[model samples]
Target chain A: TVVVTTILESPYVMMKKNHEMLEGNERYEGYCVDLAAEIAKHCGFKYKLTIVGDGKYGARDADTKIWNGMVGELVYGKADIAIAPLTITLVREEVIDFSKPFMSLGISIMIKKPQKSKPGVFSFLDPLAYEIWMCIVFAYIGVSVVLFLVSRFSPSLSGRIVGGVWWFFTLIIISSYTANLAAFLTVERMVSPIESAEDLSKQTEIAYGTLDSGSTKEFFRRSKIAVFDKMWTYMRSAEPSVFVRTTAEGVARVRKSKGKYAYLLESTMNEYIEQRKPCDTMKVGGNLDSKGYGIATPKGSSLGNAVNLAVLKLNEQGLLDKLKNKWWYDKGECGSGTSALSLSNVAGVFYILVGGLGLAMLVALIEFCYKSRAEAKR
Target chain B: AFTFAAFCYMLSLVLCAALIFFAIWHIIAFDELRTDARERLRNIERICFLLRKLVLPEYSIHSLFCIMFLCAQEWLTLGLNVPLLFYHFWRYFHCPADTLSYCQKEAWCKLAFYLLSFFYYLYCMIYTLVSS
Candidate 1:
């Protein structure tokens, strides 16, 4: 009789295949599905699985003042618990309850991994990094516009004198660029156009954004960080929705963009899809924020505290990591236990240090003797 | 950069000899001290060349020693080399000129200056070897 609201998100929770052939709870398979089974075994509570109708993790509308997605169902008491990749934000905890986080992730960049270009017949022209070429092209346009404006105002108002001087300046810059271009063409570029978040935000040519209704969006909207704040302004005002409604759709857009679009999604989801059909997609740089996803219950629900305890013990058992590995396949070390810095292994450095200390005392005695020459005069 | 510094050692060695030439030319307006000091310094060409040769191949050895001293920023040896300059000046006036029938002032200054320099050279040699 207990209903658990979830989603159809891949690897996390997906229909196994031909669901019509299956019975109850056999219809779906995923990480969270197995996790639900594990929690039930520990708590001895049977629960039914149902997908949230609104198909969102959770978001509150600014104007309509409504809560929806896994949150809305839990709020109305339609489900006993919500077991999915539900983010526990400040806003969500006020309306519903979250268990201690079971899996760690955060808003991470998902980009179509660029085809680090090869040297073609036109390799000489492609020597500069893509962004550097873009910057130079824009700078050329500014120079061209200035020459046009100066020439238009000329023919006597100030004569061609200003135009003559401008021509020399432009020639100097062009010659300098051409000279540097020769040097660049002779050497390898050895660089990436965008390595981190700052580079991602600076260039607007390659569009980027996060999910429409999630913690990623919420963080950007409320963030005081200069880089994130700038991105939020751009995303909010972008023509057509830069934001995607689902993590799958965001990734699909990233795959389709060739190299043009980047999706801000949970690192887990980003990496999971990277292992799927379109391996061209990848998680870029690192997490924008480190956060965790947890199981949720209606506010003041009896199951919330019990479920949190089970999550903690499962982590200790290493079952939580195994559950993730089972769904996600999804994705070094020596040592029977790191041997201590035992005396013999650590003794090498002490000889140099103690030897140096002994020498320092010698230097101090030598200094006193040198000064003792004047002491004899005393 | 190191070659420039090493050249300075060679230049100072020669420069101190030139300075002795300058001192000798200006000195001994009196016959006894004048001819005595002059003939003492100039007469013993063997001591002059031998002392310079003693520290000669040491030019390269001291070049490497200079870099190690540079690593520690050892200003003590930098000025300690100043002691070498004065040793040249002492030899300029102190050579045992007539006493070399035994090798007073001509042969004695030769023995005295070259011996001080040779000892100072070995002192730095031992200092460099200890650090090595």
Candidate 2:
């Protein structure tokens, strides 16, 4: 019996709802499961499916470690082959054999669609608290008044020193406050309607990350492009790390972030999630790089030849496209999503403006009346 | 009906406009005030009006509008503010400089008022931005 290593990743190889009750191959169902069945039927090999123990796509460990996940499973002779959505990466290619990929995909990003913004024409005011605003104004006036008084009335050295200290106090306080305010203003102001990976790398407010140990992360890590290299530096050492163990975890983070986080994954999976219900996420830009998912095998395994031919026949005959349609489009939920500001999204800014204009007009009229009254009195 | 910050901002703008009106009045009335020291001191009074206005707003709206332009990435509006801001700055430089009787005190007061008032306006702008 042939040994196959796969992961229980969503829509790839899932344990069906009643999987526990089902026996053998019938227990699992997904794109990979069906693909595995087709490949096996064509190659005439009977196979037993085993989930990868580590729950990882595949990667070599940097701490003098060899390999792990299904990659390790194939290399260590623990399994004859892997038939899941395992990425064919450069590092993996040298260590294992991958058949012609069954599906073409690329690294892509997933971000939460911007939501209905909070109610208020005064979202502009929320940065500083009500009390804080009052105190700041009061703080400066009091300090300035005191400084003026000390400069004028304080005759002694002790009084002069106190004034000097207060001067420094206001100086530093205003300096820090001014700098922080600039950042706060800039933070939300320039937050993106991201163009692509380039835009994602340019800003820090909306953080984008990838599956922690997969081709997505590795691609960033090894990228020679300036932006991707910059991204790798950030993700590899981000404070609240940008790496996620699972695609689901990354997607959940994106949704929860309320447009603050973006997850990088395979284009196929990214497109899949973009169409799922509560479909907050959509692709930010075109594909980052084109790569594919090949059925990986143990080095020099006799099985490689048959699997390569099967994937080609599958691709040429449009079987892969049909399977993608069945899993991706047929079960799709959300149509799509964007960065165009809706009226509701920016209504607050205009509302404040009109209100501000009206206030100005009313004040102008009052001033005109008061001035006439003053002139009449004179 | 509007936000507290919004309320403060509009009120602040009115007060600032009023403050500008007083300074312009004093500068234009520079010759007519034959009323002794009040003339030399009118410049000081003008400085105080500037402060009252600055404090009110710095105490009121930060650069809420600048924040809007920035967030919207209406770079056109944001860039436009540069020339707009410098408009008043140029006015400050070209304004009539008042000199007192004694040359030393006259030179010092003239230079002092212009520089400090210029600096003060810059402060007003900065604090408005920080607070808003």
Candidate 3:
């Protein structure tokens, strides 16, 4: 019987909760469990599934250059094959051989869903940018001054006509601006501060990090790109040490950090978690880099060729996609839909608009009172 | 209420047209005042003529330079135009008292408005060009 080494990653190698009375391979069930059965059937071999004792994907220690995790098991001949969500990397391939990739994924960022910020008194100004606002003010002042000058000097029908035309222009511009401004203010915008890896490095407000020892950390540590290098430096020197020992721990930290923290992990796991309970977290940006997961075998193992052929055959038959849908989406608890926008998200802007109209009415009343007094004095 | 709002907007537009018509009528009918107004308007026309001659070629050259060096570095050339526009506005505002009185403050104010509009439109055009 082949000793198949794997790790207990979600939907891959989970231990059946009622396995108390079961024995052998019956004790576990998941994507890898189902996968192992198919691969063994194709290769005409019996196999036993064993979880990695250290519960790690794999990483080499810097000091001794010793491999750890499932990779180590295969490298040291403890397992004849590894059929888990084990990523295929060049460094790992040097130690053991990988079958043709069974699953493709990349590193992605996960963050709490952005909260709509409370609107201020000047929320009406949100539609146009500061530069546009300045231009409007300049236009208003210019038009008003020009009208006043034309009327004062010419005192002719032509002067009044020019003044009227400008007044009409101002009135229309201001009215249209006011009409469109309401929609912008009333519609709450979801504000995500970091959209990509570059955005993360450009800002200091959101803290980001990855699993303590995984392909993600290695990617950063080994990356030659300046943005990734800068992020790695920030992760290394971060005061609280942003790295977490497990994906669950990192996700938990992301939840507790409110909007202040982001977790970087594989896109497959990120999507899986997004479809899970609470549904408060979301994948904000596209993956930073691309890689794939594959079955692993001892160097020069006879099963390597057979296993790769089986994976490719399964892919051609569309069974791989079928298996993925069965595992990831079939039993989804979150209904695989997004949350609808709520009234609270846009209430702040409505409050500002109403307040503005009220203030305008008050100002009009005050002007009327003052004008009446001046007329009486006259 | 919507109909009322629409009517108000249409009325303002009609009033604007009527004002233009009346101004043309006054320019033709009121001879003595027309001469004075015409003189003031001529002062504005002369300045506009000089500005068009000096500015059009420079704007075209800047556009050509922008097309050639278009990227983050294009901001350098674009930044130069803003100060140039500001300098022109300043010079016009501080023209000799005799010229200012000859055109009257209204004409000067109209000239200032035209200059600002031109500058604003150019700024927007360059922004869209570089960003796209």
Candidate 4:
């Protein structure tokens, strides 16, 4: 009987709920389970599913240089086949044979979705920049002074006519400015600090790192690119350690740190978490490096050829994509693009308009009363 | 009582219309004043006399120095103009008594209009400062 080894990664291989009562292959369910079933059926093998004793995707130890995780299980000949979201790396391939990749992905950064800040009371000044506002102020003062001087000193009526036209021009310009300003204040905006790997490297305030022992960490450690190298230096020297032992821990740390921390991981896992419940995390920037996951077996194993052929056939038939859609898209908890501005976002602007109009009406009433009183006194 | 109230409203409406008419009349009257040759010459002489006194040079240099200092502290845009606007409004409100006489029969009405316009300008300036 073929002994299959796997790790407990989400949507790939998860322990079946109430698995204690289940027998054999019935103890697990996921994309990997379905894939294993297809591969086993095609290869005509009776297989028993086994979970990796160590909860790792496998990495070489620096001290002993011994392989760990599913790779360890395969290299030691404890399992005949391995089926999981195990990334195919050159190092792992040297120790064990990997079939053609079942799924392709790359390292990506995940952070909390940018929060929309409340607009300031004077947010009306946003449309025209501060420089423009200053220029307008200077122009207003200059024109008013000139108008006053000309009207006072000049004999001809030209000064008065010019003053009148200037006043009208100021009225129209100010009216248009205020109108545009109101629209600017009413719209909501999302502000993100880091848009790419380079942005993360350049900023010191937001701490960023990757899964401590995964292929993502390896990518940064081995990268020769200047930006990635700088980030690697920061991650290695960061106090209290920026890296996390598991993806869940990394995601948890991201949520807890608010916008101050960013987690780097495989793009597939990043996209999957972005769609999960609470939906607070978002994937920023494109992937960093291209790679794929493949089922692994001991070198020169008889079943490796059959499993690789099965995976190739499954990919050709589009079963892999169908399975992915069923798990990732179909089961997504958060509705797509729910962050579009609603009435509540712009409601404050309308309230301010109404309040201003009410104040104007009150002033008008007071003016009327005072005028009537003065007339009565006369 | 209703009839009396209606009459009061009608009187106010007429007063408003009359105020607007007087304002237009004042503008036209001032336009005619531009034809006085002696007054025009006197105004030019006054300007030249002020220039000879170095009023423009002193104030321009001092104001430019002050503006540079304010801009260095990042207060020129939102903070500096506020006090300047206030100074302008102060000058406006404290205008010489003879200034109103220039508008003739529209003096009181024109004063009222100027006060309203001044308040509106002040309101807008204050809002812009606070928001920005």
Candidate 5:
């Protein structure tokens, strides 16, 4: 008998209203639960669909290079299959194989559509950005030309000019010196400080939590903008709530609690809360990003192949369509199926080559133009 | 009654004799203190001359050195492993007669260990500073 690990996620999997009316596994129902049953029937496996013991669905150990949680169960031989709305992350694909993505979504920041702040006419092309760049570039070029000319024509003046620049910089540094270096270190902090739902939930300083082992952890972990380490510390303190089980709890805590608890949650969940209360709560951020969810299995497992086939079959039978319609992901328009599935290797190479090359060029340009120039003048 | 005065003088002479013996012993034991002693001895001589004093008993020097040695030893030992120091302390206070000879035999070795431990602590401090 196979133990199919699951979590109580809304529309995906949850305990039925008449769960007591049914017997054994039939007591529970959700999109994934029903889908798991269908997959089991096709594969002819006697399987028990149970949730993970702790809510930490998956995690990467940077030290160990091991995956843990519902994902880990398959890798570690604790479970034969994981039929959850698990996303196929690059890191996870290395350890455990995932079926073709059964659903598509990504981590997105949901915000109140901001009133269009008309830029004072072509903002970047307008005077400020263009002038700032031009001044910076030209001043730098001019300085270099002047230094070169002075050094060639009058070495004494060149030496004095260099000395003057050094003294100027010295004055700037001396004037800026303060007793509170630690206080000023906070200035370079990110614009979007909160990176995850877990960050929102775990804040004892705040009073709410996000869904456990869901996109909340993934969102924070993958956020390139935020100081990930700080966000991690914040997330480590977060509270866990099954949004399906109790949606209002997080909102209630936010409204009543003296601590100003902010929730980083799905746009749909935020929308649902807003529809219920027009003025009480709001989702301040907008669609941050998106990803897809799929079934995961151990490498070379027959069940994996069967489940993968079942997923594709589900897509064909429009059963997936029906299931998605029942879920919050049913944004009315059926998403174009995972294109990543087709161009997997090409996309991998493209990301590596393009990303690496772009970063290298940027570093080279900064080093050559600014760093070397500053050092030479010095 | 005169004999009582003589006895007090005799006791003082014995104490002075003990002091002189310990002074020579401390000089042989502590290489570091020898320079300090030479400088201090010159000062004492000047002070004695200024007072137009007669030669005090040599034993007085030994008694003063013994007292100073005991104080220095106690301070040094306090900085080391407390247990071993406590053992020596117990022996000194509770069994003074036997401890006197025992301390005389072990004093050099104890001093060596104390210096080694001090040097080791210095090494560790230097190492930590450099590494940090």
Candidate 6:
């Protein structure tokens, strides 16, 4: 008999709101629950559904340096198949092996829309084209023309007038640069998204949380999107969470206050937001590249062929589509919340670049003061 | 006639006995020397009087046991190999009635098993090293 390991999350797998009303196989029902049953039927195996112990699907086994979780159970020979939204990450793929992906999701951010920007128009192009660039350019041109005229007309106070003109021209140039820089920084700051799988690099300072050893964490580690050195960067520099609380708690905190926090999760959990009210949070960003999910078994096991066939059949029969629709990810487009990717890469890169520029200006000011003092002495 | 297996079994037993005896002797002698250090260092006058006497015998005993165990383990392993060599020669030439079939079966089975086990262990070892 196969032990099918699962986790408690919405749409994918959750206790029925009326779970007390069900029994036996019906006792466990969700998209993943149904997928497990179908895969078992296809593979011709009788199996039991058990949630992974420790409520953790992934953890480091310091003794062996192996990863543990539902994926770990398979690696340790505790289970025959894991039919959950187990992401096909590079690390877990090497340890155990995953069928293709069952769903797609990317790391996303949720932020309360700040009152400054007109909500609907400003944000529509936030991730795509810049909506605020034209106004910035126009203001810079207007200020330059006015300053040039002021500097040209004043002759009686020529020396003082020239200095004032230099100040005015510098102010306008700096203002436009500052405004554009600030706008980009503010929007990106308000939302965060995982840009590449290497976004795990941010795990050093940010509390990165994933669904244990499932797909999100796995794909982050395994996908071609993450580079080789960065994997070590993650291991040495970052911490991955095996507990849902690591993610749920962080999202809860973000919901309650104005702080920066991100949750890496499967899209289904985010979709269930309205019902669970997991902090009025919404998912943002395009789903990372994904493959359909499949059931896997040990090599040469009698059940392997059957499970593969079962998944193929489910695809043919439209059962997979039904499950997806039942779960409300039928459209599966980018979500409506803040983009976590923007916060980390776009906003993160911008602020870091600007902060660096600010430091440069401070150094320039010091150099200017020193040069002026030396000239006066001479 | 003593078979090679019998010689190996006897050698292993003697090696084990020598190892245990030497270990205990070494531990006791080292403890005595450490005690002498504590006693002597704590009181310089007492060292000239008492602690030196306590350490002289212990120092010799500890060195003697350590050397004894090291030499014995070397000789014991050589003695154990004698029986293994004898067994190989005996089986190669003796040719009991069923020996042909037995050798054929054993050789192929052992060869295959070793190949598979080598690969398995190699894969596991490499995985561990790289993952680490």
lDDT of each: 0.66, 0.68, 0.70, 0.70, 0.55, 0.52
What tens digits encode model 4's per-residue C-alpha lDDT throughout A1-378? 877888887888877788888787887888999998888779777888888888877877899987788777778777777888887777888877889998988888899897765545555566667656555555555455445445433336767677788889789878888788566556645778687888888889989877777556777888788888898888889987888888789899999988789998778888899889789999999988898888888897787788888889999999999889877878777667434445655566788789999999999999999999999998
Looking at candidate 2 chain B, the ten consecutive residues that score lowest on lDDT are B53-62
DockQ of each: 0.01, 0.05, 0.04, 0.03, 0.00, 0.00
Predicted candidate 4 versus true structure: per-residue lDDT over B1-132, tens digit per residue = 221222222222333343344345445544544454778778656644643342232234225324533543434333533554454456457634354244443444454653453454345444544552
lDDT by residue (tens digit), candidate 1, A1-378: 689889888677888677888977999988898899999999898788888888777877899868878787778777788889877788999988899999987777877766645434334344345444433443444345334534532225433665676678669757866787667546534445777789878998888977787667878998789899989889888876888887778777877786678888778877676666546766678877888889999887898889989999898999988977766653301111022223543353577679989999999999998899789977
lDDT string, candidate 2, A137-158, tens digits: 5445444544554443233665
Provide the lowest-lDDT 10-residue window in model 4 chain B.
Answer: B1-10
For candidate 6, give the lDDT of residue B29: 41
Error of 6 at A290 (Å): 5.2
- Interface RMSD values for all candidates: 27.6, 8.1, 13.8, 20.7, 45.6, 46.3
For model 3, residues A1-378, the per-residue Cα lDDT tens digits are: 988888877888777887888887889988888888889788778877887888888888999988888878888887778888887778888878888998888999998887756544455566566545544544454355345545533356765676788779779878877878666657646777677889989998889988887668878998878889999888889978899898889899999997789999888888888888888788877978988889888887788889889999998888888878877788667775534655655576788779989999999999999999899998
Worst 10 residues of 6 chain B by lDDT: B1-10
Error of 3 at B48 (Å): 34
How would you class the docking of model 3? incorrect
TM-score of chain B of 4: 0.29
| lDDT at position B110, candidate 1 | 43
Q: Score candidate 4 by TM-score against the native.
A: 0.64
DockQ score for candidate 1:
0.01
TM-score leader? 4
RMSD of model 5 against the true structure: 28.2
Q: All predictions: root-mean-square deviation over Cα? A: 24.8, 17.2, 11.6, 14.1, 28.2, 35.8
Per-residue lDDT over A269-378 for candidate 5, one digit per residue giving the tens place of the 0 to 100 score: 56445444333555553455666678888876777777778889888998876865555334322232111223432354456679889999999998899988999999
> Which segments of model 4 are wrong by more than 4 Å?
A18-21, A59-67, A118-122, A155-164, A171-175, A185-187, A212-215, A337-378, B1-132
Docking class of 2: incorrect
Better of 1 and 6 by TM-score: 1
Model 3 residue A371 lDDT score: 100
